[model samples]
Target: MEIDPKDLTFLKELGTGQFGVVKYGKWRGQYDVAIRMIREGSMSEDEFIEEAKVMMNLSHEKLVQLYGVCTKQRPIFIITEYMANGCLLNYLREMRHRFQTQQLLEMCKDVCEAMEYLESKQFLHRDLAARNCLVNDQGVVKVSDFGMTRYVLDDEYTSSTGSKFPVKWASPEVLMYSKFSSKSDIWAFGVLMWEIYSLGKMPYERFTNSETAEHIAQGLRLPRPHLASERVYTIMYSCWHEKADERPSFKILLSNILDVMDEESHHHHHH
Candidate 1:
C-alpha cells in the first residue's frame, strides 16, 4: 500500500542524523506523532524494508511500537509512537545529579525485561545505548532504534562504509569484527548498567573509536559500575567476561538482577 506523503503535514523537525531526519508531524487529524524520514543513498532499500518487517513482527511493553512506513517517496519514512520525554541520554543529562540508586535499579529492570523479550524472539539489538532508549512522562523506558537490529539466524553481517557504530556501548567481540551473539548483547548491557549508574557517562573517555576498538580487541573490559553495590558489580563483571561464551545470557542476567533487587529491598526495610 502506498501512502500519499501529501496526506501528512510536517510541523517541525524533531531530530536529525547523518542518514535520517525525524520530524514532529500529523497524519489526518492526529497530533504529536513522529515521522522519520530516511535519506536516499544513506542505506540500501533492502535495509530499510528489512527494518520495517522486523519491527512489524516485534511488539513488547518495553519496546517502542512502529505505526507504519512509506517507501514511495525518494526517501522512506517510518512512523513511530511519539515519546514526549525524549531519549534516555537527554534524561540522564538533565537529572544526572539527582538520580538515586532505586531509580537506577528500576531503569535497569526495564532494560532487562526488554532484552529478555527480544532474546525470546531470537532478535539481537546490535546497538543498545542511552540514546536508543526512550523515556516517557511516567519515566518508564522503551527500547527504540531498530536500524542496527538483526535476527540471530542472520549472523554474517558486514560493516558498511560510513557506518557510524556506537563504540562506547558495543561489546569487545562485536568491536573486533567477530560474530555477535546474544551474549554480545549482554556484554553491551553491562556497559549500559554502568551508563545508568554513572548517570550517562560514556564507557570510556579520552579514547578514539579506533583506539577503543583496539583495546577491546586486546580483551580490555570497561570498569565495573562505580556507584553500584557489590552485588551489582558482580553482575556487571559476569557480563563483561572476555570470552563471549562465558558471559551469562539475558535470561540469567535478568534473574540475577531481580535477585539483587529483592535482596536490596529486604536490606532497606531493616534500616
Candidate 2:
C-alpha cells in the first residue's frame, strides 16, 4: 500500500514505553488515528518496517488497524486506528459495575477470534495478557501489542531471554524452555479471562515470579474469581493443562465459550 507521511496533526499521549509512545492524533486533518512514535536510534529502521509490514498486511475487526508510517522524521511515527477506551484491563476495573457477565464473555470471544486469526497466519503474539488488549468506545476489544511478535514459521519460537516474560501469565513450558507457540498464548488467555472476571485484579498476586512457575509445575491452579461461574472456571482451567498440546486451540476455545453463552442465554430467557 502507498503511504504519505506529511499528514498527521498530533493530539495527546495515549501510552508510553521504554522506546516509544503511542499518541492520539488525526490523519490528514480529518481521520482519528493512534501514532506510535519511536526514537530514531532506539531500534533499527528495518525493525520498524518489519513491525509495520505484518500489521499493515492484516485486516480484522478484533485486531487493531495499521494505517501506515512516517520514516522521514527523526522519531519514526507509525499510524494505526485509535482505540477510544484505552487498555482493556483499566476499562474493566473502572466499569466493573456497568457490565454483565455475557458482555465480558463477548469481549473474550472477540479476543479469541483475533488470536485465532493470528494463529492461522503463523504469527505468535508472545505477549497475550489482558493489558495488551485495547477497548474502543463501542466496547469492542482488539488485540494490540506487536512488540514481541514472532513469525513462528513452524509455529514455535525458542527465546534465549525468558526471564523478562510475565511469569503469572506464562505456561510452565514457556518459563522453563523458552518455547512459545499458540498453545502458550492460550495459557495467557486463561489469565486474561481471570483478569476480566476479577475486575482487572492481577493474577497470582500472592506469589513471587519464581513461586508462580513453581506452583504451576506442581499443578496448582488459580482460585476462581467470585464473579466467575463454575462453567466459566471450567473452561479457564482447561487452558492450564500441563502439556501444551493438551490445551485447546483458540478456535475450539471460542466455540465452547459460545456454547456456554448460548446455554446461559437460553436459561435467562426461560427464567
Candidate 3:
C-alpha cells in the first residue's frame, strides 16, 4: 500500500544516521509507525528495490517488521515498525552498570533466535550491533537495521560500494577483506554477546578502527573480560576463532545458546 507523503503528519523525529532521518508519523488515522526518509543520491532505486524485497520476505519474532516502502518521489521512504523504547544501547545505558547474567543471557537468546531465523532464510546481517537492536517494554529484543544485510550468495562485503567498513564488531575475516560467510557473522555475534554482557560497552574501545583492523589481521582476538558465565565464555571463544573455518556456524551457535538456556532452566527447576 502506497502512503501519500502529505498524508503523513510528522509527530516527532525518531532518529538520524548516515543514510537519512527517521520520524514517528501518523498516516490516515494510524497511530505508530516510523518513516525513513533517505537522502537523494544516497541510494539508488535498485538499492531501494532490493531493500524492499528483502524486508518483505524477512520475518521473525525477534526481528523488527517492515511495513512497506513509499518511493512516489525523489527521496524514498521505507516505513518500518516503530520501536518506542529505542535501541538496546538506551536500555543498557538505563541499567547504569553491567547487566545481570540472566538478563544478559535472555538478551542473547533473543538475538540468537532472530539470527537463526535470518540464517535459515540464507540471509546475513553484516552489521549486527547494540544500536541496531531494539527492546520493547516487555524486554523482547528485536533486531533492526537491514541496511547492511545481504544474501549469502551476494559477493559484496560492505553495504555501500567504496564505503569504509567499521572494524569494531567485524570478524577477522571481514577485517581482512576476505570472503565472509555465516561463520564471519558468528565472530561478530560473539562481540555482540560481549557487548550485551558489558551493558552495551563496545568491543575494542582502546583502538581506532584502523588499529583494530591491523590487530585482527595479525590474529589478535578481542578480549571478553566482562563475560562472566562459563557458557558465555565458551560461546564467545568458539565464535572468534582466528581461523574462519574453525568458528561455529550460526546454526550450531543457536543450538548451543538454546542448550545453555535449557540447562539453566533445568537447574532452577531442581533447586
Candidate 4:
C-alpha cells in the first residue's frame, strides 16, 4: 500500500547510508517503521520505485519487510520494518562476550534461511554481510538491504563499469570478473559466518583491499574463528572453494547450520 506523507511522522534519525538517511518513524501514529529518505539525484525516481516494487513481493520472516513508499514528495521515502537492535554488526560487537556457539549458529541459521528464499527465487543479494543484516529486540536476525539485490534471468549478473564491491566478502569469480551470482552471496555468507563467530570482526582485517584481493587469488581464506568449532569452520571453508560450483547452496548451508545448532543444544543440556 502507498503511504501518504501526511500520515507518517518522523521520530528520529536512525542512520545514514550512501543513498539516503534512515529515520525512525511511525505510520498513522501507530505502526512503527523506518523511513529511508532517498538523496536527490542519487537514483532516478522511476528506478528507485521499480526496485521497491520488486521488494514488495519478497516476503519472508527473516527478511526486513518493505511496507510502503512516499513517492509523491520531493525527497522520496521508502518505508520498511523497524528493527529495535539495529544492524547485526554493531549488536555483535557490543555484545560479543555474551554470545556462545549455540547463539552464533542460530544467527547464521536465520541468515541462511533468508538467503535460501532469495536463492530459490533466482534473486542474487550482491551485498551480503553482517552489516547488511538487522537485529530485532528479540535478538532475531533479518536480512536487509535489497539495494544490491537483482532478479537474475540467468544465474549471473555482470556489473557495469566502476561498480564498487566489498572485497573482503567477495568470491573468486566476483573478485576476478565482476560477476555476481548466488554463489557470490554464498561466499559473503561465509564471511558473515566468520563475522558472527569472531564477534563482528572485519574479515581479513590485517590486509589492505588490494592485498586481500591478491591473497584470495592465491588461495587465501579466512582463518577459523577462535570461538568456532572445526565443524563450523568446515562450512566456512567449503564456501571459499576455488570453483563457484563447489560452494554449497543456501539450502545445504541452512541444513548444516541446523545440525550444528542441534548438536550445540544437545551438548548444552548434557553440560
Candidate 5:
C-alpha cells in the first residue's frame, strides 16, 4: 500500500509496446504482476495516474485488471494482473495446430463478452487488436490496453485527423475521418478475430499501412482464415462494410457466435 519503488522486484522484461517496456515482476514481495512503466519524460505523470484510475475501476474477467500505480518513483509504473502465455497472437502461433475450433471459439467468446459489457456501458475500445489481447496459462483471453481503457469516460474517442492509429485494425471511418465508436471498435474486433483464426499472421501481411488503407477504400477485404466456417467468415465480412452503422454491435456479434458454438454443440450431441 505504500509508495515504495524498491519494493517491486523486476523479474524479467516481457516485451515492449504502448510507449514503454513491460516487466514481469513481484509486487511488494507478494503477487506476480506486470508493471508497465515509461520515462517521466515521455508524458506527464498525472496523465498516467488519471488514465490508470479509470482502468482501475474497470474489473471484468476478460478485461485486464489495473492494480495500482507508482508515480512518485522515476519512470512511472502502472501495475496490472499478469498473464503467462503473453499476447494472444503469439501464443496461438506457438500452439498452432493444437487449439481445436471450439477452443478458438471459447477464447474469442471471452473477448466478445468483455466487449459486450463495455458496449452496455457505452464504452468504446478504439484499439482492439490481437496483440492487445492476452492468453493466460489456463488459455483464457483478456483484453488489455492503456490509452483505450483510459479514454472510456465517453462512449467514443475522436482522434484528431493527424493523430496516428492502428492502421490495419481501424475501421475505414476511423482511418479516414478519425471517428471512433463502438462500431469502429467492432471493426477492430473483427480483425482481431482474424488474427486468432489465422495463427497470428498480421493482417495485410503483404502491404504497407497506406496500401492497406487504399485497398480497403477500394472495397478490398481480408480473406477468411483457412479454418473459419462460412458463418464465421460472413460475420467477419459484415464488420468491414464501408458503412459503420451497418456493422454488427458487440451484443449481436456475441449472439451470433453463441449460435455458431451452439450449432457445433448440437452436431456433437446428435452424433
Candidate 6:
C-alpha cells in the first residue's frame, strides 16, 4: 500500500545513520510504524524507490515488514513495523550481563530463521549484522535493512571496487573481489554472532580496515567469546571458512544452531 505522508504522524526522532533520520511514528493515526526519512543526495532516488518496491514483496515473521513507501514526496518516507527495543547491538551492549546463553542463541536463531527464508527465495542480504537487526516489544529479533539485498538468480552478485562496505563483517571473496553470495551473508552472520557473544565489542579491534582485510586473507579470525560454548563456537567458526561454498547454508546453520539450543537446554535439566 502506498502511504500518504500527510496521513502519518511523527512522534519523535528514533535514530540517525548514513541514510537519514528514523522516527517513531503512527500510520493514519492508528498503526505504529518506524519512518526512515531518506536524506537528499544520500542515494539515487529512483533506484531506491524501485528497490523498495521489490522489498515490499518479501514477508516473513522474523523480518521487519516494510509497510509502504511515499515516493511522490520530498525526503522519501520508508515506513515499516516499529521495533520497541531498537537495534540488537545496543541491546547487547546495555544488557549483556543479564542475558542467558539460551537467550542469546534465540536471538541468533531469529536471524538465521529470517536468513533461511531469504535464502530460499534467492535473496542475498548483502548486509547482515547485529546492528541491522531490530528487536520488537516481545524482544524477538528480526532482520531489517534491505538496502543491500538483491534477488539473485545465479546466487552471486558483485560490487564495484571502492564501494563502501563494513569490511569487518565481509567474507574473504567479498573483501577480495566484492563478490557476494548467501555465503557472504553467512560470514557476516558469524561476525554478528561474535558481536552478540562478546556483548557488542568491535570486530577486529585495533586493526585498521585494510589490516583486518589482510589478516583475514591470512586465515586470522575473531577468537571465540568466553560466553560461547565449544560446540556453539564451532557453528560460528564454520561460517568463516576460507571458501564461500564450504560455508554451511542458512538451512543447515539453523538446524545446527537449533541442535545446540536443544543440547544446552537439556544440559540444564541434568545439572
The local distance difference test score of each candidate is 0.75, 0.80, 0.73, 0.83, 0.78, 0.84
Give model 3 RMSD, 1 decimal.
Answer: 3.9
Candidate 2: the clashing residue pairs are none
Off by over 4 Å in 3: 97-99, 147-164, 262-271
* Candidate 2, superposed: residue stretches over 4 Å from native: 17-19, 39-45, 147-163, 266-271
**Candidate with best TM-score:** 6
Question: Per-residue alpha-carbon lDDT of model 6 for 189-217, expressed as tens digits?
Answer: 99999998888888988988778888998
Residue-by-residue lDDT tens digits, candidate 4, 200-252: 99998888877888888899899999999887899888888889999999999
Query: Which ten residues in a row are the worst by lDDT in model 3?
Result: 152-161
Clashing residue pairs, candidate 5? none
**Per-residue lDDT over 32-132 for candidate 2, one digit per residue giving the tens place of the 0 to 100 score:** 99887775545656754676676688788899887887776667777888999988888988878686888878888999999889888877777787888
Model 6 CA RMSD to the hidden true structure, in angstroms: 3.7
Which residue pairs does candidate 6 place in steric collision? none
TM-score of each prediction: 0.86, 0.89, 0.85, 0.90, 0.88, 0.92
Give lDDT for model 4.
0.83
> How much does candidate 2 score in TM-score?
0.89
Worst 10 residues of 5 by lDDT: 152-161
**Alpha-carbon RMSD, each predicted model:** 3.8, 3.8, 3.9, 3.9, 3.9, 3.7
Ranking by lDDT: 6, 4, 2, 5, 1, 3
Clashing residue pairs in candidate 4 are none
lDDT of 3 at 108: 81
Using lDDT, give the best candidate's number.
6
Candidates sorted by TM-score, best first: 6, 4, 2, 5, 1, 3
Candidate 6, poorest ten consecutive residues by summed lDDT: 151-160
lDDT of 1 by residue, 1-271 (tens): 2456776788887778533798878876565567888765556677657666766789888888777788876788877777778888778877766777888878888888899989888888777777788887789988887444442122222341114556666676666664677887888888888888878787787887777777877877777666788778788778888888899888898899999988877875764
Question: Across residues 169-223, which tens digit of lDDT does each residue of candidate 5 receive?
Answer: 8788878787878998889888988888888899999987778889989999999
